[PDB]
């Protein structure tokens, strides 16, 4: 029953100001934080060699797209390597991002690890020396972080252990971030994998998010200096029941209204295996949902911002402008979508 405040008024102001800049009206996050091996696979798909130079050029292409992206992009999350790379003019990538009015983010977790005695469930590691890593990242120009926890809907999953443990590790990570002037994005990713319906996902989202917010309260997390990064509430990708965009929006907004305190600055949705355009339409329907939404409802999209840009580039320097144009188009669509202002059956044979 006793306060030993985690944060001064000045530390709170700094964290709240950062969180509000990232999700300011019309703004979302470019997730460009794929690991070396991941990005090598993106390059493979467009017949491009996995070189440090090709990785740097691809990231440059996204970060130096024209000024039309500036009002669309509040934050850009980077992988460790990219934070220390430079644009062709010699400018560090954090400086490139800042000059365009973006906040720089850093992925800080060290991946998922198996929970013994569970049905293939995981927790996330990365707490060791996280404080010194955060202080260094802060000096190097980052003001927000990402930590990804993964939960799966299945017969006996997510278990009581997996929910409790991932909520606890998210709260530990958030606490360490806030001591170092880094806004933690809290990411409890519930996978769209499986044949569960919309109701089951809504129920699971509500239980996970309740446990997440209890853990953040227990660990004295300042909610105004945080963001939440969940999946949208959707059926599983193997579910054959079809739903409208308005049904996805209603289930998503209802789940968040039942669990997410209004003090949380913003919700930056994952795309959860959706197409580029579908992710925009669903984000838009969310923002048009006729229920009160006391937080920013925006995007933290990777593939959903990049897929067309990557293909339009195809590893060719000559294609820089066409590739940047594809990214700008998605940034613009998602900027309208996070304001409810975006205006743009099918059986796949691969599912058989």
């Amino acid at each position: 029953p006793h306060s030993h405040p985690a944060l001064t008024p000045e530390q709170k102001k700094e964290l709240s100001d950062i969180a509000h800049r990232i999700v300011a009206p019309g703004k979302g996050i470019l997730a460009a934080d794929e690991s070396t091996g991941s990005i090598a696979k993106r390059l493979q798909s467009i017949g491009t060699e996995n070189t440090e130079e090709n990785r740097r050029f691809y990231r440059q292409l996204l970060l130096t797209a024209d000024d039309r992206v500036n009002p669309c992009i509040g934050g850009v999350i980077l992988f460790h390597e990219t934070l220390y790379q430079k644009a062709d003019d010699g400018r560090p990538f954090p400086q490139v991002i800042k000059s365009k009015g973006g906040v720089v983010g850093i992925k800080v977790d060290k991946g998922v690890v198996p929970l013994a005695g569970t049905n293939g469930e995981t927790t996330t590691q990365g707490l060791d020396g996280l404080s010194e890593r955060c202080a260094q990242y802060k000096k190097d120009g980052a003001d927000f972080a990402k930590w990804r926890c993964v939960l799966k809907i299945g017969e006996h999953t997510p278990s009581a252990l997996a929910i409790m443990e991932n909520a606890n590790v998210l709260a530990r990570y958030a606490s360490i971030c806030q001591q170092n002037g880094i806004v933690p994005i809290v990411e409890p990713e519930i996978l769209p994998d499986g044949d569960h319906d919309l109701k089951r996902c809504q129920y699971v989202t509500e239980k996970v998010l309740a446990a997440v917010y209890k853990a953040l309260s227990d660990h004295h997390i300042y909610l105004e200096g945080t963001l939440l990064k969940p999946n949208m509430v959707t059926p599983g990708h193997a579910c054959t029941q079809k739903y409208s965009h308005e049904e996805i929006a209603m289930a998503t907004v209802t789940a968040l209204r039942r669990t997410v305190p209004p003090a949380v600055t913003g919700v930056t949705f994952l795309s959860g295996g959706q197409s580029e355009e579908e992710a925009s339409i669903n984000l838009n329907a969310i923002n048009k949902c006729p229920l009160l939404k006391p937080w920013a409802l925006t995007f933290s999209y990777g593939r959903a911002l990049q897929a067309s840009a990557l293909k339009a580039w195809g590893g060719k320097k000559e294609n820089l402008k066409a590739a940047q144009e594809e990214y700008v188009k998605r940034a613009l669509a998602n900027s309208l979508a996070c304001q409810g202002k975006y205006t743009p059956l099918f059986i796949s044979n691969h599912a058989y």
Binding site: A31, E34, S35, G37, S38, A40, K41, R42, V150, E189, L191, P192, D193, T234, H237, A238, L270, S271, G272, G273, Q274, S275, E276, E277, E278, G302, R303, F346, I347, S348, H350, A351
Partner: peptide
């Protein structure tokens, strides 16, 4: 090298759009 965002299960709209 698994990336859930790029490699994970996709929606039917993902398939429709990339056909």
């Amino acid at each position: 090298d698994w990336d859930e965002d790029w490699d994970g299960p996709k929606s039917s709209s993902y398939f429709k759009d990339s056909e």
